[PDB]
Each structure stands twice: as structure tokens, then as C-alpha cells.
Design a protein around this nucleic acid. Sequence first.
RNA 1: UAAAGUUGCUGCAGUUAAAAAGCUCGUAGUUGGAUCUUGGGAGCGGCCGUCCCCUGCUCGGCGCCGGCCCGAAGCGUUUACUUUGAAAAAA
RNA 2: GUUUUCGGAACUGAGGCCAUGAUUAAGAGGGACGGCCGGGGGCAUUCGUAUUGCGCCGCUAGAGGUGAAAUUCUUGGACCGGCGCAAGACGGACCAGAGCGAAAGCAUUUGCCAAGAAUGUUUUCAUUAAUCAAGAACGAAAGUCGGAGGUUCGAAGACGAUCAGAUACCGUCGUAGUUCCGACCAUAAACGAUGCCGACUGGCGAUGCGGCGGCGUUAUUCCCAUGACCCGCCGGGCAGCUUCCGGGAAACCAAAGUCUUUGGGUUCCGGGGGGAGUAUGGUUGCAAAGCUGAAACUUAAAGGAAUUGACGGAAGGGCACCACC
Lengths: 83, 129, 98, 149, 91
Amino acid sequence: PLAKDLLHPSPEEEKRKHKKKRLVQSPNSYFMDVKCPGCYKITTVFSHAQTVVLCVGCSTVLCQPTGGKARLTEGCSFRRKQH
Amino acid sequence: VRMNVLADALKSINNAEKRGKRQVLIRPCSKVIVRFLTVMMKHGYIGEFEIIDDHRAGKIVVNLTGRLNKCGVISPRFDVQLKDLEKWQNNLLPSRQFGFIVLTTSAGIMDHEEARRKHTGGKILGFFF
Amino acid sequence: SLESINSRLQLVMKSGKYVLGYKQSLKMIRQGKAKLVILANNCPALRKSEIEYYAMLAKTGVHHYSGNNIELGTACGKYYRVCTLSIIDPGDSDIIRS
Amino acid sequence: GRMHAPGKGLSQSALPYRRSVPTWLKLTSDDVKEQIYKLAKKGLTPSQIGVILRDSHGVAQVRFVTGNKILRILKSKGLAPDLPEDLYHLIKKAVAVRKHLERNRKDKDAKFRLILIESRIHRLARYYKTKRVLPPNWKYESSTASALV
Amino acid sequence: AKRTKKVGIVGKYGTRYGASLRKMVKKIEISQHAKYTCSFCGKTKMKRRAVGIWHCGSCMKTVAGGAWTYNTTSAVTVKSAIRRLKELKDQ
RNA sequence: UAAAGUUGCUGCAGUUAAAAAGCUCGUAGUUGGAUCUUGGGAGCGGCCGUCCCCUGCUCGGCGCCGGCCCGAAGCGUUUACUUUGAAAAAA
RNA sequence: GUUUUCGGAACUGAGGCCAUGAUUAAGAGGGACGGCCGGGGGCAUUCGUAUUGCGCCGCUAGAGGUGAAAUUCUUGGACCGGCGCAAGACGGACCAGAGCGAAAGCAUUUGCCAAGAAUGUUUUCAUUAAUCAAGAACGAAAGUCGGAGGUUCGAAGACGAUCAGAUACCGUCGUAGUUCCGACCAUAAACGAUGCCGACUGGCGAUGCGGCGGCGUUAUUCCCAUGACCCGCCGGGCAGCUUCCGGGAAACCAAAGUCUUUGGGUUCCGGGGGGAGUAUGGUUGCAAAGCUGAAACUUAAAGGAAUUGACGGAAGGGCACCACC
């Protein structure tokens, strides 16, 4: 194809492109409002935390750093947010 | 690395014209580029272009017509007198009827004929026909 | 685990109070001010045994270091060799909690 | 591409367009700084203050919540390390590969990596000298480098 | 200044004994006169007293070593070999 | 000398015709991302062309009722570049 | 005489005021961090048959080797079969147009040591970069100098064949070497015969590593989460296929393209064929040699790609009693 509309890229393909190769650079990560079952307080954790984080009171662990997105502990309620 | 930024912009829109794209995207936007595109737009060689100004070196999407033969860039930016400007457009432009040599002067960035009217030379940027 | 100690020791040398050498650190054990004693592995066996006995009287733990007195000195950031060493107060290091 | 390797990888962070403080973040410009102050005192390089801060406390960029960046925050308080962290980590790496090399002297690859690492040290050194961050007579000497961990 | 071009310690022999013999003795004679770091006190004082005998001028501790070097390569492989059979017999 | 774009700055060539160092490091050398003022106004011609303005701080005559107008002298980051002028033996 | 208002010069205290002073965070770079990944590197360790040799036992007259033979071994028991032992090499099949490494190169196990690409990243620094005379590290094999070891193989050499002759191809022995350790050497068709960095310009199916998403299947079983498949997407990595992108003398090339519509940056390097990588000088090396490097003279071609023939002790089909059977 020759005629495209790079001014108005469709969102289905815009999320496909690499984070830097998009029309306007935008990250793929986000933040969380995680609540472990042992406690009630809400902590803000990063999608790709890359460092082990503990709940208040040394209740339990929340995240395991991996190659990509951190592995959330099963049983903890998390709500993705955005600004 | 990317030394000359105007060179990457012109070669891209020159490649996309030979292929026949309707509008081309150039990755870095500099002040000299947008000043260069307007000299081409004021002569009808390109279409309406737009600057996607993010918080970095922005991107430009230039609507392309079928009117551009070649838009080269002369590197380095040689100094041009008004005495040798005729000799440049003698071996850089296709004919004496059309084609323009874009060169920057203290008065700004304009083609070689406006540099004749304002009677001042300067560094040469590129050429388009 | 070893690099944790150099990381801890370096944090002590910039912040905490410490005492290099044997005659000086032996007084700190005697004064009770010492909290942790480091010993180079090539410490003379009589002097190592004496330090460990002193610390048993003062109930301060000893950490028998791995390197000799040459590289224990470089671990403290010094250009001389250190055979034994006492930490009077870590200041802001976690070395005494391990 | 990498300047001491044939790799042409493209992998790095990409901060979003909006430079505003996040709507979820409830830490003031002050309290974040005393958080930086505490981590800096227990020993932590400005690089890893930022990571600990955006995982536990959820600060997108400290340059947005306050008006300065981490290293500029520590130096104004006088808590910054004297020689830069990226230069510290290169000397720390060269000391390790030189200590590996004294026993294993048949390791021609380690000898090759040593030249690459030292070449990067002298490159940052002469940069940090023009920016007047290091004394103009500062010089990495392989011998006395191990004292600086 | 650098007094000699490629004749080190063996410059004392002048023009005698031929080039190769003056070259293979250089590597040895540098070694047998070098001061080593005493592995007991840490000071660089291990110095060969007689052939095979190495004395540390600081801790006054004598060590049976190689003839021209402090440690013979044949010895250090034997010390490490014995150390493996030792723990392998007693388990 | 041109022909010779067979010395190539304009303007050559280097997969196989002559040819890219075995490979990397590296100082001189060369080359270096983006980013800091555009617009508006009076006049004229059939939204378009042209002109001027966005200069600051000692002495005098269209003078007028300390202030204003105007004339001249001095100062206002530095080079490169460009335009101008001077000075630039004739043959 | 004197002190000052007075004009100038310099210093020193308290202020007031400034919108009081730090552009961005590159599909530039460095560094940190995360889980991985890989015949990357080093050291140590382990295993495997095989080969050669030896000991013993068995039964035997040939065994080896070749186009055919001989040299050679053999009733002093060879070859063959069995059981053991020792030594030094080597790391089969799995092994791929797969991976890793700057290149040379890299493959039994396990352990230790240091390193690294790519990926992920709302981390940090903030132009630190690109290419690079001089200079430096590494650099197959062969070769050199010391030690250790020497199974196999095998330059030299000896011999047996072949031949007009063979000081060659083939065969039997076999020295240096091949192996390890420590120093030298710096060259290979060290090849992709293709400098590096950056941008742009068609698809297609795969593949390796990392990440993201998704029916279902199968493992723990007790499911979520993890593996193993299955469908996609993203990054870069070795490649492939396809094509009127375009180029090229063509062969061919998604680069060898974006080149008379000639200029992104920067190293090296060529100028008809020989003489000649020679002479000489310098320099490096223990030597072998390496690096640097002419001229006299000679010559009208040498060379590249492709075409048609002829030819082939090239292959595939077919034919002839001027061919054979």
C-alpha cells in the first residue's frame, strides 16, 4: 500500500509497535494497588518491579522479580491504575 | 552515528517519493528542517506537513505530491559568495528554468533567487527540483 | 556473602567508629566498647586465640575474616595491612546484624 | 550500537509524555527527599535509589515530584559519593577482573576484557575532568585502585 | 635511565658464556633474588637463604621451598592433589 | 596542456577485472542529536506585494510650558560566515 | 593648621528585591538493576569406547595389504576369540545452512572463578559520541626454544610395487612433529575474496534468545503458578525464499540499492602487464622469516563476466559388424 494515515494510526496496531517506535513514545508498564489477603493496607507496586517487596508487618511477599512483569503472589488483590 | 540531521530527512523523503508514498515520516525534527520544508512547500514541491511535537526531538509527517524529482543535501555547508552562486546552480540544478538551491543567510533560510533579491549569500544547505 | 562484608565494611569506614590494629582494639574489648571483631585468616594462632578468649569475656562476637591481613586492609580502604579490627559503633551499617 | 561490542540492541526505558505528578501519588516534594536522604545514608547509589523508590513508594520520576533529580538532590545535601557511580562501577569491575587474572593468567579472554574495561575508564575519566567533577590530576592507576572498592 | 637494552641482571657476566646461556639464566637469577610476600606475616620479606631454604626477614619463619623460586609448580599441584585425596579417604 | 571522470575537490575505483589492514583497542586528526523570539501595527497597489517600529545611558536650537522634541559625540559578548567601503604599481 | 559637606578610588557589615539562577532525557551513549541464555574463557574433576602394547587362556596356519602383488607378521603360535592390565591420544552417533566469541576459534560429566550479548526497565548520568596516523592486546596450522610425555598418525628417511624412468601417486615401516607446560613467531583462499557507524527503501515462511498476549492439550496433582506443545505480537541474531525496488560489464546483490537527479560521517587502499613483494636501506626475531619497499629494463596486451562451438582418461540417454560380443 502507498496511501496510509500516519497522523491517525489505528490503536489496534499502535499497541503492537515497539514502545520507542510508536508515533509518540509511551511505556508499556503501569502501577498497581495491591492488597495482600493477610492484611488490609494498600501498597503501590510497579509492573516490572525487579526488586522483591514485602507487605507491612512482614506479613508476606508480594512480587518476584523476573525477566519481564513481576510475578504477583496468588491471593493478593491488585487494581491497575493510571495517571 | 547520526551526524547530519538534514541529510537523513531529505534522503528519506527522497526515497519515499521514488517509491510513491503519499506521506512520509522523518524521525528527528530540527529548526532547519522545518525551515527547509517551507521553502519547498512555498514552491509547490511538497504538500501540507505536520510536526508531531512530543517532549523530544519531534517527528514530521510530510504529505508528498508527485512533483518532487530529487531533494538532495550538500555536505558540508560550503560558503557561497554572490560571485560563485551562479557557478553552483550551473552544475547543481537541472536547467535554468526550474530547481532551487536552498542556502542559509543572515536574513534566514531561502532559495537562491531570494538570495539574489536580498543581495546576500551564505552557507548552502541543499537543493530540490 | 563475602562481598556483603566488604560492602558493610566500606560503609563502616565512612560512617562508623572503628579501631584498626591489635593493641588498640584489645583495649576496646577491655573497655567493653567493642561490638564486633574482625580477624584476618593469617593472624598468628596465639593472638587469634587470645582475641577470641577476650571476646568471650566481653560477650562480643568475632567474625573470622576470609582474606589475609593484606586484603583485609584494602577492604578497610587502607594502604597498610590490618590483621585485627574492632567496630566500636557501626553508625549506619548492618554489619552487626549478621 | 554498543561501543565495546557488536550488539546493536534497542532496549531502554521510555518515560511517558505527561510530565505531571501521578494522581495516585500522595508523597509531597519534601517527604520524598527525606526518603532519598535515608536510603542514601544507609549506603545506596543514586541509580538504585530510583528503583527502590518506584517499586515500594510508586514515584514515577523524582524529577517530576520535585524539581531536581536524585544526584542533584544528594549533592545539595552533601551526601553524594565523591567519584561518580558509573566510574565507581567500572573500577570495581576492573579490580575484579584483574584479581581473577593474577591466578588465571592463561585466560586471554579476561585479558582482552580488561583492556575494554580500562578503555572505558579512561574515557569517563577525561569526561569527568572536563566537567570539573574530578581533580584535573586524578588518574586511575591499576595498583592503587583496589583501595576504592 | 634505562642502562641496558635487553640484558638485565645478567649484565654482570659481560660477554661470557654465550647468548642463550646468558638468557636462560636471567629468568632464574631474577627469581632467586626476588623478595616474596611472606604468607604468614604478609610483609614482602621472603628471601632465599640457601638453595631450597626461604627465610622471612620479618616473622623469622623459615620455609622449605624450590631451588630458584619460592614455590615449585610441581609442588603446588602436589599440595592440591594431596588435599583432594585427604578429604576423599576420610570422606 | 587538453583529451584524462587514466590522480577524480567538482568527479573515479576497491564481491569476482588492480584493490578493505586477520581482528579489536586507541591518541593526534576528522566529524558530531535536539533545544533559547516570533508576531502584531500605520501607509500603498490588485486575502496578496513594499516601507518603518518593538532599541539603553555628554554637548546644543523650530523651541515650547523640572519635562518634552530634535541634532552631534561615547558606550553597549567574542570569532567564523556574508554584504559594503577603503586601501589597494604599471604592463 | 584643622575637620567635613564636596566629586572620585577602594574595602567592609546589614539588607531589600529577582517569577531569585540548573532546557530536554535521543528508536545516541555509559552505568545500575531483573530473570534468563549460550560447543564463550579459565582452572580443577569425571566418564567413554576405540587404538596400541603386555600378561594369561583357547584353537589353529596363515595373516596383512593391493587394481594385482610384494616388502612385513607367522608352529619361537601370527591373525582370530576370551579375560584382565597399562599408556597416551580423541570426544563418534545426538550435530542442524542451530548457538557463542573481536577475530583466530569453541562439543563427555560435575564444581569453582571472572566476563558478556540480547531482552525487560515510568532507574541513574546527561553528549560522555563515530571513525581512527602513532601505539597496544589477541591471532589456525606449520615452525622455533626449553621441560614433561610419547597411543595413533606421520614431513624426512628406508623399502616393496607401478613406470620408458617415479628420487610421486599405491603399500609396509618410520624420525621431527602431532599431546601438555612455559616462552617466541605474527602469517593463511586469516574468505562473505564484500571496512566501520547511522538513516531510508518490497513482501514470505521459518529459526535462536528474551519479553508480552491467547483457545485448547499434557505433566506436579490439588489447582493457581510453572514446564512441554499450540496461535500470534515485539526486539536483534544467523540465514532462506520470492520480485521489474533499484543497481550492475554481467554473473548476481534487500545490498553490491537510495550514483551524471553525482556531497550522511570517517579510516585503509588501487592506477596496463611484467621486472617484483625483488634489490637496497631501516627495523623486529634465537632462527625461519615479518614489516617497510624501489629502479633499470621489458611489453600490446594481461585480465573480468557472459555466448556459440570444439574438446574431456566428465556424467546421463541412444546408435553402427567401415565397432565389439
